[PDB]
Amino acid sequence: MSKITSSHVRDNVKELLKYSNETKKRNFLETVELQVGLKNYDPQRDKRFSGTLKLPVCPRPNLSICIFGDAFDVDRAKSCGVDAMSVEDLKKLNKNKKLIKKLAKKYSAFVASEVLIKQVPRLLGPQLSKAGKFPTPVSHNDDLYQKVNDVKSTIKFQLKKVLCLAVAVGNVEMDEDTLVNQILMSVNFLVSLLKKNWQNVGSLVIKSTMGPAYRLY
Amino acid sequence: VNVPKTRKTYCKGKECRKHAQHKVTQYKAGKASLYAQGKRRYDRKQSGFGGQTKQIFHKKAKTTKKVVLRLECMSCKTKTQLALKRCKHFELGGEKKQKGQ
């Protein structure tokens, strides 16, 4: 009630994030995610659609970024926190299978310039695949300092071969009433794919890294 | 017969109202719905004692059936219908070509 339990939506957050015993407390910035249970859970014959819809309030489990920019973007990247890379450097990474797995699992975010979106998904593709961390659309005239927010804001919506999604919804840094709000947006994009959402005001928990048995609906 | 899949053609549109790209899918007939005026007139009549108060066709000579193409626009996604001459086989897309062996 009150637009998906607005009374105990922020008190849920207030009791988790600022706690060492209940929420363990890691050194990196603790990110929050959701879970919801619809009656629409069918494996399907057609197979699942998967449409990566954006959100204006930023999702963003961004630890490291490994770019592929050249000429303009190498100058812009080195000034910022990220680190640049060359075209011939990609051939050295692919030459052994181990260093591809380091780029796959940890380095989640990506930035690739307009000229370097014509050589990328061949070598990584088969080895990567299940993670699905491919580059973002970027041109040479971008700012890079601002472009970190665009990758951070966007998130995957792939649903195949399992009856669950887990879309992130802010973190420790973001405001209290945003997270949730985001809750209205996050569920709405599930309603875009499915027919019957079950049923506007459904189920939630708050799982911020060490989200304990606080268990929601 | 084979057809290209997508093709350029005129659409009425009203925006628009010129040549543009299209998708191509095959037209299938809808289910009879059970609440049309003729079905209600038929079921009211056919109830009592008498048995089949109308004609039942079973002198079907010819073999095939005309193929129809449901064209769907790209921009405003309005739809049209373009018929085709009678043929037994029909692959909507798209085993080209070949020539020049």
Place this chain on the structure above:
RNA sequence: GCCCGGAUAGCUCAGAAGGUAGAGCAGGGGAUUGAAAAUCCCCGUGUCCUUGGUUCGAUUCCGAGUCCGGGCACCA
């Protein structure tokens, strides 16, 4: 038009869930016997109906499309 079942070596018939490609019919040689049969041994034979697909891999599984053989429906 509906919802089901089956396809495998030249022939015929298994296969069976997770990782193979097989008994037989024959067909070819050995072993055995004074020989002629019956029996132990060692071979050659595959688009696993057809396509993209599905898959770490699959004839299977998984979902499409066409070819063979059997059922309950019928107002131009």
Place this chain on the structure above:
RNA sequence: UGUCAGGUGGGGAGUUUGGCUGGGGCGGCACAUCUGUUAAACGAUAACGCAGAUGUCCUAAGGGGGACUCAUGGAGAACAGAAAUCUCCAGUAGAACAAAAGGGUAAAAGUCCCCUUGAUUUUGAUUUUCAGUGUGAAUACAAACCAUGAAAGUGUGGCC
């Protein structure tokens, strides 16, 4: 026992069980169409007359532009032979053009190479069978919107 629904039910009830046709029936299609001829040098024209075809196949075998000549024969080139590929000379079509047959076509309507969707939209006028009714096909424009070519042009499906 009563009402409604599913099977069974010639035990009984009602009704139909083509036409042309050297009598009918058995065959056949001459019963919707197309080519040549019968058909008597405008058109029209019969028989279960004669020789034969159709219920399809094609995103190219449709549309535009540019290259180039085919049947067959002769003279020469290792394996190569009557027949493989290569080169020259003669070559009015004696080839080819999705199928029946007739017509048509040679810097092409044939063969090869480049780009595409005029097999598109809105409606009427007009030839053929003809009651100058319909059905089918075909021809010539108007207003649009496109393709192709340096252009003139050509194209509202298949050379007729």
Place this chain on the structure above:
RNA sequence: GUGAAGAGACAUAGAGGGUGUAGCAUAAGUGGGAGCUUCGGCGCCAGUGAAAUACCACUACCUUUAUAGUUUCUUUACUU
């Protein structure tokens, strides 16, 4: 009309149930994920692969049952 006792669940339940191969080792999956913990230990780290593990949770796939809820019911008794 009136009484007795055997079966399919839907709530709602976590104990587990998972052993091809390479991987300390019996990996059903999906996310967050660099420390929880006094120390202990196990992870990040490193490494084997198609897939990474702790620490937290959600979803399946199979067994279990002890809930007085649905009825496919199935078994007998009582006279008006």
